[PDB]
Design a protein around this ligand. Structure first.
Ligand SMILES: [Zn+2]
Lengths: 38, 141, 357, 136
RNA sequence: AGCCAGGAUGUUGGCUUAGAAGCAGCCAUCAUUUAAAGAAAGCGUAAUAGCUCACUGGUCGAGUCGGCCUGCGCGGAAGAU
C-alpha cells in the first residue's frame, strides 16, 4: 500500500475503490501496485 | 492420437552430423540424449537435400525413442541458391541488395507441396513471394 | 612478391600465437564446453556468467587463427592456378581474401592495444634527465629527438609543452604532447628508465659512461572538475553564534553546519550576520573541502599505484642503449639491433610489439 | 536556457496578466497545447517542458515553441531591507493570458502527442488543454 | 460484461547479440489455411519452452462505450491550553 495524492491504474489488474471516503488502488497480480490516497 | 508431452524445436544444417555447438543442451535435456542426432538425423538427410537447415519434429517419449518426420526445406534457405544474394534485412527496402523474379519464386514454391497446408499452387507462390519481400528481396514483375 | 608477403604474414601470425597461448586457451576451451554443454549448468549463475562470456571471447581467437592457417594456403592455391593458365580474375580474387587476413591480424594486434582503460586517448611524455650532470642531459635530448622521429614516422601531431634545456647542452626536463589514433597505445609500453652506455664528449679524459634518463609516458585524462552535489547528499543544520551581541545574536540561528551524509566531512561557518550568506559560504567551503577529499583520494590511489611500480625496481631499467658496442638490448625484447643510427632516427617498431607482449 | 539575446532594457514592471490571448489557434503543426489557466512560464520551466516532450517523442517528428520569455523578474537578495532600488534579474518569464497555444507538434500519433503534453503540463505551472489543427 | 476452445502456419520473417525463436536490439510489419490468429499487445525462459491479450464460433439477453459540458461532492487536507 503506497501513499499518494494521484492514484493511477498502473496496470490492467489495478482496481480503484472508494472505501467510505478514502480513495484506494488494489492490484490482484501485484502486491506492490496497491495504493492509497493520504 | 496422443497429446503434446514435451518438444523443443531446435535444428541446424542437415549436412552437419550431430548438432552440438549451436543448439547444445536443448535437444538432450528431457528424454532423448545428445547421441541420438547423428544416426537418426542423417538418415532422412541423404534422401532429399544436403547442407541446409531443415526443421524436424521432436515429440519426446518416456520410452527414449522419438518419432520424426522432416518437412520440405524452409523458404528462407531455398531462396538463396536461386536468389543470388546472401544478406537480408537491416537495410532491406532502404537500398536494394538483390533481385527476385516471379517465375523463380513460383519454381521455388512447387517443392513445398507437403510442407504447407494449401489447396492451390498459386497461393503457395504468393506466400513465397511475401516471404521474399519480408526478407528484403523486391519482386520483379 | 605477393606470395612472399603471404609467408611474412604467416610468420607474424605464428609469433603472435605463442604469447596468446594457442595450446593453453584451446585446452581451457575444452573444459568450459565439458560443463556448459550439460543442461544443468545454471545451478550457479554467478560463475557461469563469468565463464560463458570468457569462452565466447576465446573462441574468437583460437578458431580464427586456425581459419588463418586454413585461409593463407587456399588463397595461395587460388593464386597458383590463375598465373599458370594466364587467367586474370583469380589473381584479383587471391589478393582480396588475403586482404581480409591482414585486417584480422590488425584486430588481434589491436586486441593487445585494446587491453586497458586508456588507449586511444591523448598522450603525454616526460623525459626526465638522470644524475649525469651533462651526460644525462645529452642523453635526454637524444631520447626526445628519437621520440619526435618516431612520431613523424607513425603520423602524429607532436606538441612540445614544457622544455627545460640543459645547463651546458641537452635537456633537463621535457614534456611533449602526442595526439592521434591510439597514440598512447604505442607509447604506454615505452614508459621507463633508459640505460645509455657511451664514450662521452664532455669528459676531458674521455671516460665511458653508464647514464640514465626516465621517459615517463602518461595519458591525458578527462578534466572532471567537480560533481554537482544534489541537496539529498547534504545535511544542513543551523544553531546559535558563539559570543557577544545582547538580545540579537543570542536569538539567531545564523550559524550553519553542513555535513556530507555518506562521507562524514563537516563544514561550519559563523562569520556573517545573515543565515543565508553563511549557508552559501559554508556550502562554497563544503564544496571546496569535497574537492580536497576527492583530490586527496585520487592522489593516494596514485601513490599506492606508483609504490607497486617502485617495488619492480631494477625492472624500470628497460632498454639498454649500448652505443659503445652499437647493439641495443631491451629487457623484454631479447634481440639486438646493429644499426643504432636507425634506432635513433625513430624506428622502434622492433621494440614496441615485443615490450607489449 | 532560453533567454533574449540583446536587451533594450535590463529591468521591468510586474505588469498585469489582464487580457485575452493572441496566439490562440493552432498555426504550424497538427497537435497543440492550449493554456486554460492564466499565469507565467519561467525560462527554466519552458526548458523542462521541452525536455519532457523530447523524451516523450524519443526523437520523432517536429515540435514548435510559440512562447518566449520576454519579461524579466527582478528578485531582491535573501534577507534585505525593503528599500535600496530594484533587485537583480534572476530569471525570465512569459506572461500567459488564457487561450495561449504554447507548443505545437506534428508527425506523431494523437495519443502520443496527448501523452507528451501531459508530461509538459506536469512540468509547467498552469492548467492546460490539448487541441488539434483547425481548418479556417 | 462474464465463460467455453482456437489464438497458428510459410516461420526459426529476416538482420542480429554475452544469451533474443513476439520480447539485450534493429527493420521489413507480406502472404497461407481461414470463423479468426499482430511476424504478437502485457507477464514470463539462460534464448527456447510456457501464462495471457488484440481477434475469432457458441452461450447469456438489452442496453453499453469514451469524449466535453458544467452543477455540486470526496480525497489531496497534519499543531501545538
Ligand atoms: Zn498491477
Amino acid at each position: 500500500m503506497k501513499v499518494r495524492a494521484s492514484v493511477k491504474k498502473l496496470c490492467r489488474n489495478c482496481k480503484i475503490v472508494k472505501r467510505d471516503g478514502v480513495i484506494r488502488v488494489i492490484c490482484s497480480a501485484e502486491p506492490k501496485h496497491k495504493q492509497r490516497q493520504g | 492420437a496422443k497429446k503434446v508431452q514435451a518438444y523443443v524445436k531446435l535444428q541446424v544444417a542437415a549436412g552437419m552430423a550431430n548438432p552440438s555447438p549451436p543448439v547444445g543442451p536443448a535437444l538432450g535435456q528431457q528424454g532423448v540424449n545428445i547421441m541420438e542426432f547423428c544416426k537418426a538425423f542423417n538418415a532422412k538427410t541423404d534422401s532429399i537435400e544436403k547442407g541446409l537447415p531443415i526443421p524436424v519434429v521432436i515429440t519426446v517419449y518416456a520410452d527414449r525413442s522419438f518419432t520424426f518426420v522432416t518437412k520440405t526445406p524452409p523458404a528462407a534457405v531455398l531462396l538463396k541458391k536461386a536468389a543470388g544474394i546472401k544478406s537480408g534485412s537491416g537495410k532491406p527496402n532502404k537500398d536494394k541488395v538483390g533481385k527476385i523474379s516471379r517465375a523463380q519464386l513460383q519454381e521455388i514454391a512447387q517443392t513445398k507441396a507437403a510442407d504447407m497446408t494449401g489447396a492451390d499452387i498459386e497461393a503457395m507462390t504468393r506466400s513465397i513471394e511475401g516471404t521474399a519481400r519480408s526478407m528484403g528481396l523486391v519482386v520483379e514483375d | 612478391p605477393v606470395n612472399n608477403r603471404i609467408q611474412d604474414l604467416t610468420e607474424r601470425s605464428d609469433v603472435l600465437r605463442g604469447y596468446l597461448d594457442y595450446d593453453a586457451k584451446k585446452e581451457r576451451l575444452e573444459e568450459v564446453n565439458a560443463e556448459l554443454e550439460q543442461p544443468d549448468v545454471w545451478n550457479e549463475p554467478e560463475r557461469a556468467q563469468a565463464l560463458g562470456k570468457e569462452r565466447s571471447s576465446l573462441e574468437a581467437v583460437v578458431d580464427t587463427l586456425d581459419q588463418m592457417k586454413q585461409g593463407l594456403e587456399d588463397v595461395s592455391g587460388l593464386l597458383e592456378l590463375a598465373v599458370e593458365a594466364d587467367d586474370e580474375e583469380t589473381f584479383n580474387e587471391a589478393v582480396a581474401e588475403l586482404d581480409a587476413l591482414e585486417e584480422k591480424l590488425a584486430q588481434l594486434e589491436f586486441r593487445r592495444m585494446f587491453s586497458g582503460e586508456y588507449d586511444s586517448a591523448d598522450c603525454y611524455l616526460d623525459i626526465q634527465a638522470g644524475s649525469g650532470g651533462t651526460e644525462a642531459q645529452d642523453w635526454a635530448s637524444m631520447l626526445e629527438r628519437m621520440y619526435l622521429r618516431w612520431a613523424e614516422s607513425r603520423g602524429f601531431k607532436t606538441e612540445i609543452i614544457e622544455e627545460s634545456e640543459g645547463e651546458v647542452a641537452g635537456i633537463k626536463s621535457v614534456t611533449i604532447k602526442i595526439s592521434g589514433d591510439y597514440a598512447y597505445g604505442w607509447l604506454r609500453t615505452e614508459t621507463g628508465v633508459h640505460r645509455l652506455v657511451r664514450k662521452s664528449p664532455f669528459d676531458s679524459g674521455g671516460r665511458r659512461h653508464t647514464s640514465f634518463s626516465s621517459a615517463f609516458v602518461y595519458p591525458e585524462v578527462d578534466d572532471d572538475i567537480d560533481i554537482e552535489i544534489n541537496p539529498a547528499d547534504l545535511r544542513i543544520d543551523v544553531y546559535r553564534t558563539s559570543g557577544a551581541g545582547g538580545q540579537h545574536v543570542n536569538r539567531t540561528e545564523s550559524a550553519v553546519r553542513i555535513t556530507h551524509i555518506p562521507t562524514g566531512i563537516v563544514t561550519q561557518c559563523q562569520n556573517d550576520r545573515s543565515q543565508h550568506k553563511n549557508k552559501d559560504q559554508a556550502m562554497k567551503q563544503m564544496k571546496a573541502k569535497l574537492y580536497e577529499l576527492e583530490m586527496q583520494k585520487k592522489n593516494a590511489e596514485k601513490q599506492a599505484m606508483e609504490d607497486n611500480k617502485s617495488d619492480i625496481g631494477w625492472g624500470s631499467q628497460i632498454r639498454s642503449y649500448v652505443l659503445d658496442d652499437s647493439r641495443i638490448k631491451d629487457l623484454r625484447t631479447g634481440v639486438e639491433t646493429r644499426n643504432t643510427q636507425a634506432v635513433l632516427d625513430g624506428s622502434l617498431d622492433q621494440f614496441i610489439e615485443a615490450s607489449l607482449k | 536556457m532560453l533567454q533574449p539575446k540583446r536587451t533594450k532594457f535590463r529591468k521591468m514592471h510586474k505588469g498585469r496578466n489582464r487580457g485575452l490571448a493572441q496566439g490562440t489557434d493552432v498555426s504550424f503543426g497538427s497537435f497543440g497545447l492550449k493554456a486554460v489557466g492564466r499565469g507565467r512560464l519561467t525560462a527554466r520551466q519552458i526548458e523542462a517542458a521541452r525536455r519532457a516532450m523530447t523524451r516523450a517523442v524519443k526523437r520523432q517528428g517536429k515540435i514548435w515553441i510559440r512562447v518566449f520569455p520576454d519579461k524579466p523578474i527582478t528578485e531582491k537578495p535573501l534577507a534585505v531591507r525593503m528599500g535600496k532600488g530594484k533587485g537583480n534579474v534572476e530569471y525570465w518569464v512569459a506572461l500567459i493570458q488564457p487561450g495561449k497555444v504554447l507548443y505545437e507538434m506534428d508527425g506523431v500519433p494523437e495519443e502520443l502527442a496527448r501523452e507528451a503534453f501531459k508530461l509538459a503540463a506536469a512540468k509547467l505551472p498552469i492548467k492546460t488543454t490539448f487541441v488539434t489543427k483547425t481548418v479556417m
